[PDB]
């Protein structure tokens, strides 16, 4: 179908001007790596770029990112035209100049920064009236190049004299500039993202189709999630990214006014949408106008409420309006909204993990200049309970911190700061972990849903009850089909029961790192906390959560809290009934096998489990989990002594059959205490060895050597003697015959 | 509409209000639909506004002046009739209510069908199944399901055959079609069930599906057909149908089954209630709701009753010996009161289910209330090999098994038992099955034959190997004890 015209969408790469193609495409279009081809695109305006090769992207996708695609004015999802043009020519000094009316911290000699080290090494094609950007002073600058010696582009080359001139002319008027965000400045959010992405697509840049069948779109969409979670940047992202004119709404400023005028600000705001369709329509502080009606006293709130609803009704008959809400959790509002037909979608935005945070980092640290000692993997994997919002405080702090020490001292009085000494300044991991320790306000104290990194090589034995975990949760998800051919039905629930300390917590997340699952645990003290409290409508609120959540895994341990707290295994006048386990029963009867939310449980005392939970359609496979052997105990030790030094003298093996009827905390411990044991001789060793010269004045004396960087047998044979036995052999007898009774 | 008039103020709602009802009355024969009446007219415990007062006045009025002009009738909409004022359910208001309850597989059938009119389909619908699995959904869950699903396939195939090639027309616009993969994404990410509540319906279960039991059929046909058959039989006589039995016996006898065969049998609807709510009841200390229960019986007549666990609240306050106190606790009290009171005619049976007779309040067995006792025993081997057949007769087996061995093998199971040995097996084929395909699957992977294929159904039906190897794990479940603790209560009646 005149294979010329192809598709964009985004790119991995940081710099600017290159397309990377689909591999299975090389000579249709005849052209490798090392020639620059021409795009087309709207208004009669074109680009040229260098190619690379890559296998992830489709075949009908070329990767390009912002800068390279405003200028075609090609937005993504739309279709451009790709020639080859080997016929390539060098300019002379293509005449380049800053675009705008002023640019922050601008003079004197920009060019040898924003413009020299960008071209070099380089041999960027360019084309006059290009608005390629180039980073740099933590500033991002863009230059249009104006004018162009040869035509219609050129390649940069080393040999061009360079033009110094540095004047603001003003943009112009009609290209939207570049300093709206877009998909690329958001991380952490990827699956939300393409869910509102594929859900509010069509009806934007296809309406005419809408109108060619007869189908109902979405006409109210719902985001809950804390405060600082990128949702008004999602809205104002989704908006810039489709052409779909973007109206904005606070709750404050209408319920700082009175009824005539907040009550006709509203409509005025919803006519005005109406005009500029497709348009979409955000709202924030929702909870401040709509509240449920218990917390709602004057006639006037309970009056801005109707007329809310009734435009929301009256919002489906007209025009392709998209209304979009936020607020912080799904309950804090009125049930009425949550219909069909004002707000029936809803999404949740949750938290990042340390990948999304890494991830915003690097969008935060862009402009910054960093040093070599950055690691900002150890910063991510340190930084529990931040958002997006504590990460670019924190971000902001650390460059403070250095910048304030160092020029107070270094310009105050020498001369007026300029831009060279301003971006001379690097930044430095201290001053991250000063700003990361001095100042942790964590937002964040609630639940925790995400993929887990714990994997099975963690694990030391156990490999049937691997094989019998895979059968459970694996086969179900990847072939129903074979459960449908026949009459079984997968059981959803299991239980194990065991000696203390022998890896029950570790499995429940192996599980979900094996099959890419979320995972959430629940712990006895939240389960104590609910019965003290009497709070248990908690309980539906978990379930939600692993409803909206799925594929995931509910874990539960210290099951047998409750039943210990009120008396022991002869307990307090009653029965082994309670007010959680009923409702937790309640709430599992009552739910679909097709959401594929598989339920754990763990405990050491299954006799005093109430049996009514072990009944068929719930809790019903059971798994003994014993303590570890010889041969898993050379595993467990060679876990976890893979992340410290070691020396070769140790014999594991002698260990480990010196040791009977232990378990992988006992062990854990050992490998903790010699640890201590190693670092306290360093320390010794080290302030006796500074302190003893420091009284003979000799300048020069360094026999610099790690005192002890591995550990010997004698730490370890020191550790052996307060190393003990944890469970007594009556708690295995007693798991023994509760094993055999069955 | 209620917000419309709520989005006012006084005198323009309540000039409106009159307006409509005096239009209302010039267009007879007029009907006024009213919906979101909670939003104008609750309870005046949860209003406090003078004027929220003030604009159901008007609406009462309104309401009695009705009966006396035109012939303009009134319906009004809401959740549940106890969220608005009682001074509407008066005698010339709002004398007839009407309950609309959940639509069931048939119901939910139909309206895919409805919702599936214009649009184009594949040969693989087979919309039983959906209904089957659409649990909870309602008229817009379906609704908006049927146009997801559509939403997927046209998404996906337009975007890429046609954003270039030519503005897309009427042809290809219509030479899509719809399959039963976009309906199953749409149906299991997109599974926004509004519906938790109780349930009301005919159930599927008969006859056939029960093993044995013949005797206690005849039994409780006796008690239930005979009544609403031939009413002037009884009349003829003295004697008036009791309503209520009670089923005690050992675990997993089929007792919650004959109360859904019966139903099914009579065609009446039925009720479930299981033991988890009446402890939430109990330590919530909300008995009102027990009403509700019966209310809803009473709205659904004919109609079972059922309840299980009975003994679940005797047992969570101590066991046999209990804690200090009575056998007498909160809600059956209150299940006695209600069931006092309660007219023979509505015809609305009641059915209890126990495998702890002894701890039950005697004051619930008296007459006038649950009075006959029915004894489910352990299945027999003539009754093992119907439950046996009943159970496999979904999947597909062998003809190498022996049915009646494997039933004269056991003594003293129970169903669950039974049914928990053909699910081990058939767990053990499919895993079979799965490992043999895989392993197919590997191992010519490496062999590069464009061209093979020995497809063969590596185990499509089982046999005795399976059934003889879950046998291993298979043992009783019923103490002989338990057995013997029943039969003596069943004698020293
Ligand atoms: N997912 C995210 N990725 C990157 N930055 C984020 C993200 N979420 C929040 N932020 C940061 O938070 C700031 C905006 O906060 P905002 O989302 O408006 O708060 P709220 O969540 O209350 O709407 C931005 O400066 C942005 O850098
Ligand atoms: N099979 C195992 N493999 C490796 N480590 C184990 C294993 N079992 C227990 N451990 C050790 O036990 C510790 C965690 O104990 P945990 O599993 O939480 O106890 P419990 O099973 O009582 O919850 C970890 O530090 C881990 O090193
Ligand atoms: N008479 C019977 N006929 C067929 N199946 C039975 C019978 N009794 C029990 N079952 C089996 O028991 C299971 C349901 O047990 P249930 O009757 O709920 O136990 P309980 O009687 O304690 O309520 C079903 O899967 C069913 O196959």
Redesign the pocket.
Same mark, same amino acid.
């Given at each position: 179908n005149r294979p010329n015209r192809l598709i964009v969408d985004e790119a991995i790469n940081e710099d600017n001007s290159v397309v990377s193609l689909s591999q299975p495409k090389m000579d249709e279009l005849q052209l490798f790596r090392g020639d620059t081809v021409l795009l087309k695109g709207k208004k009669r305006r074109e680009a040229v770029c260098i190619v690379l090769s890559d296998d992830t992207c489709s075949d009908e996708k070329i990767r390009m990112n912002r800068v390279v695609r405003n200028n075609l004015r090609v937005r993504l999802g739309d279709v451009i035209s790709i020639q080859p043009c080997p016929d390539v020519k060098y300019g002379k000094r293509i005449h380049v100049l800053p675009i705008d009316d002023t640019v922050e911290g601008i003079t004197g000699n920009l060019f040898e920064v924003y413009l020299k080290p960008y071209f070099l090494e380089a041999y960027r094609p360019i084309r006059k009236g290009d608005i390629f950007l180039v980073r740099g002073g933590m500033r991002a600058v863009e230059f249009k190049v104006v004018e162009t010696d040869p035509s219609p582009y050129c390649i940069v080359a080393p040999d061009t004299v360079i033009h110094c001139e540095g004047e603001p002319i003003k943009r112009e008027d009609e290209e939207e500039s570049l300093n709206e965000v877009g998909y690329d400045?958001?991380?952490?959010?990827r699956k939300q993202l393409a869910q509102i992405k594929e859900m509010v697509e069509l009806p934007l840049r296809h309406p005419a189709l809408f109108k060619a069948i007869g189908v109902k779109p979405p006409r109210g969409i719902l985001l809950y999630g804390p405060?600082?979670? !990128?949702?008004?940047?999602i809205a104002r992202a989704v908006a810039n990214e489709t052409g779909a004119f973007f109206f904005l709404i606070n709750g404050p400023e209408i319920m700082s006014k009175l009824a005539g005028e907040s009550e006709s600000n509203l409509r005025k705001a919803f006519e005005e949408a109406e005009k500029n369709a497709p348009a979409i329509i955000f709202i924030?502080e929702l909870d401040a106008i709509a509240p449920k009606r218990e917390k709602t006293h004057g006639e006037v709130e309970r009056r801005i409420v109707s007329q809310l609803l009734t435009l929301m009704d009256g919002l489906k008959q007209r025009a392709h309006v998209i209304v979009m809400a936020?607020t912080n959790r799904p309950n804090s509002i009125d049930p009425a909204l949550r219909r069909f037909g004002r707000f029936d979608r809803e999404v949740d935005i949750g938290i990042?993990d340390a990948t !999304?945070r890494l991830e915003?980092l690097q969008?935060?640290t862009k402009n910054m200049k960093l040093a070599d000692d950055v690691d900002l993997e150890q910063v991510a994997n340190e930084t529990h309970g931040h958002?997006?919002?504590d990460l670019?405080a924190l971000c902001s702090e650390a460059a403070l911190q250095a910048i304030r020490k160092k020029m107070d001292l270094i310009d105050l009085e020498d001369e007026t700061i300029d831009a060279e000494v301003m971006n001379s300044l690097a930044v430095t991991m201290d001053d991250f972990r000063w700003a990361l320790s001095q100042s942790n306000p964590s937002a964040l104290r609630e639940t925790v849903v995400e993929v887990p990194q714990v994997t099975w090589e963690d694990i030391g034995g156990l490999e049937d009850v691997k094989r019998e975990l895979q059968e459970l949760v694996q086969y179900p998800v990847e072939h129903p089909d074979k459960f449908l051919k026949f009459g079984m039905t997968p059981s959803k629930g299991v239980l194990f029961y065991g000696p203390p300390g022998c890896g029950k917590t570790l499995l429940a997340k192996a599980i979900a790192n094996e099959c890419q699952a979320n995972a959430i645990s629940i712990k006895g003290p939240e389960l104590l906390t609910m019965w003290f409290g009497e709070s248990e409508a908690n309980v539906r609120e978990i379930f939600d959560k692993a409803r909206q959540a799925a594929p995931c895994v509910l874990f539960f341990d210290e099951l047998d809290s409750i039943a210990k707290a009120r008396g022991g295994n002869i307990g307090d006048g009653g029965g082994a009934a309670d007010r959680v386990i009923n409702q937790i029963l309640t709430e599992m009867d009552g739910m679909s096998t097709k959401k594929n939310v598989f339920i754990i449980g763990a405990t050491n005392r299954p006799d005093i489990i109430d049996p009514a939970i072990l009944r068929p359609g719930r809790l019903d496979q059971l798994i003994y989990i014993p303590l570890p052997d010889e041969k898993s105990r050379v595993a467990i030790l060679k876990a976890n002594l893979r992340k410290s030094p070691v020396a070769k003298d140790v014999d594991l093996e002698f260990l480990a059959k010196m040791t009977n009827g232990f378990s992988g905390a006992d062990l854990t411990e050992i490998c903790q205490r010699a640890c201590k044991l190693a670092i306290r001789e360093s320390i010794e060793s080290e302030i006796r060895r500074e302190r003893e010269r420091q009284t003979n004045p000799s300048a020069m004396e360094v026999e610099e050597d790690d005192p002890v960087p591995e550990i010997r047998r004698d730490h370890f044979e020191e550790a052996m003697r307060f190393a003990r036995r944890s469970v007594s052999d009556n708690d295995i007898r007693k798991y023994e015959m509760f094993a055999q009774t069955l």
């Open positions: 400045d958001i991380g952490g959010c405060p600082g979670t !990128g949702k008004t940047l924030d936020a990042p !999304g915003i969008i935060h958002v997006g919002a670019a």
